[model samples]
Target: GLLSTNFDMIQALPLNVKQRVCALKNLQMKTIQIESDFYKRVHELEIEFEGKFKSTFDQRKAIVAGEVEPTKEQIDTPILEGLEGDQLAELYKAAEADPSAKGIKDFWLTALRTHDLVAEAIEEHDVPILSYLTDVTTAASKDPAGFKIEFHFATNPYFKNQVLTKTYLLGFDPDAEAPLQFDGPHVIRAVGDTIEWEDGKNVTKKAVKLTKTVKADSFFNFFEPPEQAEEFLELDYEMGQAIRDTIIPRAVLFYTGELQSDD
Candidate 1:
């Protein structure tokens, strides 16, 4: 009953300054608990569902490669009927009806606009380019073919202009009817070199020195590369953790309040 019962005590609190602040703090804690529970359950269900889908895909791949025979279930939908299935279905419906929810594209667009890391990277002057970021993020999420996100840096005297840039391709095109162009790896990283200065003069040096790449078939690698440097792995993990543990929960609470007010 406690879990199902909606608490509006904070909302009903007296409109006095002192009591309002106290009530607001209490309500915030309650919201934290609720959102935390929601995230935990949703993540557990997602991992479980992803595992099932991966296993089913592997079986189909094995059959296609002539390594094994395709079972009846493998020939059909990989989606298994179970707790994870029900959980995902329920969450999808919630997302669809969510007051804050528009489409997946919009969800991602807003997510990027509000994302801490994205905000930190872009400055006030670059705000106009948020649309570009949103478009790229949305397209990548919606596209079945998948895509790459590249970062470029301008050079000063130490490094000649266009001396450094990196492009990363993550995720797989499961629906690809044709053979994959890059069968060598699912994740790709291409890097450029730095300009070397010699004799107190800017020397024209080849920027393309060495390239490092990490490859993985799993979508998780899109967030944290499986073979990248230790620093990158740590950064990826921290960014992911921040979004899940802080950003999403706060957004959920804000949206929940907005939705409730509209009623």
Candidate 2:
């Protein structure tokens, strides 16, 4: 079962060779065992860094929501070698230019729109609801290994809930007594919260077409993940991955147009 192959090739040889093949299969379990342990160990690392970085996410939320201002050191972070100061000047000009001055209005909205994966996931109708988004946060789970993304939104007309969450469940399970198809731990499945949208305000689905069918047009649908048995959605997990690993960590870069899915 090396590299997920057919062992029948070795079967046409000698009967004595069967003993050698048996030993080969026995040795493969060692590698699979170590690989599983490797994933288990890395899960600890994810949880460790998650706690460390979570504070910054809260700070970012405060700054965006006009609850607090970032220090000069925070503002001084340069996106460009020479253009950051210039760009920052232009930024505040527009801010003060607004009749109602506030800290980074629609910060999460614009950041999500600028991102390629999120851009595709979002619909025009989702703009109004996402405008209320206050923060995006990630958590790495330990006991039952997984990662989750939480989107905090200010109380708005769209929904009753303050936060929408999605979880990507990950782990490896051996098939019966062996794991010939082993490819390390994987995103086994995903679980998403039902967006209890306000009456007539559910953008994830529409009361159109036959039988009032589900719609895939809005990014809000990320919270209503695939519900089929025997399989999982590929895009659903990738969306979670990008949100946690790329978007949450480098949100400012995405907002500034410095990072792209292509890059």
Candidate 3:
């Protein structure tokens, strides 16, 4: 009916025809070796850069925490470029009366809200708890060969754990037939650390009555990898990587609205 392949018909072909098919199969195997080496080196280069990126992100965490005051150079960038002489002067005057400002308040929450994909997962009710979220970072681990994202929290009323973490173990075995179906690393599975919530502060659930509780949607649900999905993977799994790939790297752009998101 169309240009197509039939395995049964191909097997029934004469020896001369069979010779062509086997030759094609042999060449495919040869090409796959090239494809496999490509990704192996790719992952190595990626993990290497992850180390170089660590120091800059470390300073970002310190600046956000107010533990380090940003130099005039670091604080020199911003929005409101349209302002004229008097307009800009008045803004500076307005800031003069305030006490010395420390670390940015709600740095991660504000950054997270600017991201179109991640922001939708954040409910209005979740904002207050998320205010404790001070920093977001990514780490590449060599032993398990995985990507790890950590959400660093300030001391807050909602949760006791200062760091909430998520890790995705990747299928980087390009030597394997199926894993090499795609040249890039595939996420095999993800694991997350538990959040120890204070008394009634577990935000992912709510009390329906005296003894009844009902599940609710929350940004905190990002910690629990969803089980079983075609769309499920597309939703949670894609999102977990999206945070590492997009938000963690370009957080300043997102926070200052310099970069536009899909929304």
Candidate 4:
């Protein structure tokens, strides 16, 4: 069974925002867990939905260059318990005494990076409304053959008990909501779905949306600074090759349920 903890003094936001933030923080926590063996707890409700921040590596730079609209969200305003990332990390380390202290610290830095990326997008883009969904269903049907996603995981003191699971549609086993935990870096990819077509014609005629959820146990503990001689390695490659071999290559036809063979 997974553990549950309440966020303390989290600013009130819509459920959707809370979920998105939680997802990012959860992913952040996973990063720390992989880096360090520490444990950190968070009030689940404090997480917010982050837009285009979910994008792939190659896509990120390009999309970041794209425009953004002024979001109602106050820029750089302290909405949560108001603790800066570093302060929050220090508190978690003091409380848990987990080996993941270093990694959790890194997660905090990443959260700041996330905030900057989001804030910049909103400040620069006309709206970025379309880019927000990031659901591969949208890309599978819309993005060309070369779209990709990737980013660096802030090492711990910032991240903790992080788990990354990539399950195929065939392998995906839905479960009631629960905590996700693992001790290594994981890269998840969605294999193209099996489709059924009719009348000897393809169905690449409509739009598609790419949707997914990454759940994590702790909201903080996912960022940090590179100490002297410490090599900071961003993601070296695209998220997964399977995405191209399976998802992107046949995205339009497959997502539209136009596969000639149902394998």
Off by over 4 Å in 2: 1-22, 79-99, 173-178, 208-212, 227-232
TM-score, prediction 3: 0.79
166-257: candidate 2 lDDT, tens digit per residue: 88888755444557667766677788887877889987776655567756578887887764634437777777788888888889887878
Cα lDDT over the full model 3: 0.78
User: How many clashing pairs does model 2 include?
Assistant: 0
Q: Residue 76's C-alpha lDDT in candidate 1?
A: 51
- Measured with C-alpha atoms, the lDDT of residue 158 in candidate 2 is 93
Task: Flag the better candidate by TM-score, 3 or 4.
Answer: 3
Candidate 1 segments exceeding 4 Å error? 1-15, 68-263
Clashes of 3: 1
Model 3: worst 10 consecutive residues (lDDT sum): 174-183
Model number with the top lDDT: 2
Q: Report every candidate's CA lDDT.
A: 0.38, 0.79, 0.78, 0.30
RMSD of 3: 4.3
Per-residue C-alpha lDDT of model 3 across residues 183-221, encoded as one tens digit per residue: 567777778788899998888987775579776889888
What are the per-residue Cα lDDT tens digits for candidate 1 across 1-263? Answer: 24435446545656696586777766765565555456445544544555555554344334423456546875454233333766756655664445453222223224434654544433443333222221121112212322223222223233232322222333332213332232222333322233343244332212332554333222123232434475664454444434434443343222223312221
Candidate whose TM-score is highest: 2
lDDT of 4 by residue, 21-61 (tens): 88897786656554433211111111121223224422422
Q: Residue 125 error for model 4, in Å?
A: 33
Candidate 2 pairs with clashing backbones: none
Error of 3 at 253 (Å): 0.9
